[model samples]
Target: RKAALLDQVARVGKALANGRRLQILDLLAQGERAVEAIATATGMNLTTASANLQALKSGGLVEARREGTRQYYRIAGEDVARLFALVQVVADE
Candidate 1:
């Protein structure tokens, strides 16, 4: 199952490979937010923001809920924020 495991972890790699997705991740690390607020905060249009969040969701790095027609998103796990911070440190080194 090592091959399968590698492929799964690569999903995280693919998710972080985008600048916009990274921005969403970083913000989500701080707190959960609705899609429209996320879009405004990240300087993205609603569709653009939704696209990035959806990509992250597919990667299993984000969680979402329907708050009465308003979609909200947050990091999928506590480790997600931890990993995000660790990656930043490693990138700077």
Candidate 2:
């Protein structure tokens, strides 16, 4: 069970390793957003934004709430926001 959890953690870490995904995380860390809003903010196409959101969601780094016909995504938790801030510090240095 411990090994399985570690493997899951590794998978989540790998999903966050992409630049585009990182940008998405940074934005979502602020608040929940629709795919179109994320695409506009990150200058990504809607398809790419949706794909990245799905990847993050699958990795358990993000969560989506569906309302009507739209899905809004946000960082999975405060822990994710803390990790994002820590990584930003590393990148700034």
Candidate 3:
């Protein structure tokens, strides 16, 4: 049971392992952004942004919606935003 719990926790840690993914989370924390906008803001290519967003989505940290050709992304909830903020605070130390 303990091992199972740890594994579940690690899923979120693994998703946040990448620096680019963290940046994407930071951007999403501000407000909803399109994939292209995130790519531009983070100085990453579209492919990179898309990949990172997919990881964030898989981790249940963000959600995506398609509005015509553009896909908009946002943080999953206030909890996700607070989690990211806490991580940032620790990283700043």
Top candidate, metric lDDT: 1
Per-residue alpha-carbon lDDT of candidate 1 for residues 1-91, written as tens digits (9 for 90 to 100):
4798788789888888897679988788778999999999999999999989988987889999998989999999978878888989999
Off by over 4 Å in 3: 2-5
Cα RMSD, each candidate:
1.1, 1.7, 1.7
- Which pairs, if any, clash in model 1? none
Which has the better TM-score: candidate 1, or candidate 2?
1
Residue-level lDDT of model 2, residues 1-93, one tens digit each, is 479899888878777778877889878778899988999999999898898888888788888888998889989998878877987898899
Give the alpha-carbon lDDT of every model.
0.89, 0.86, 0.87
Using lDDT as the measure, name the better of candidate 2 and candidate 3.
3
Candidate 2 vs. true structure, TM-score: 0.87
- Model 1 residue runs over 4 Å out of place are none
Please report the TM-score between candidate 1 and the true structure.
0.93
Ranking by TM-score: 1, 2, 3
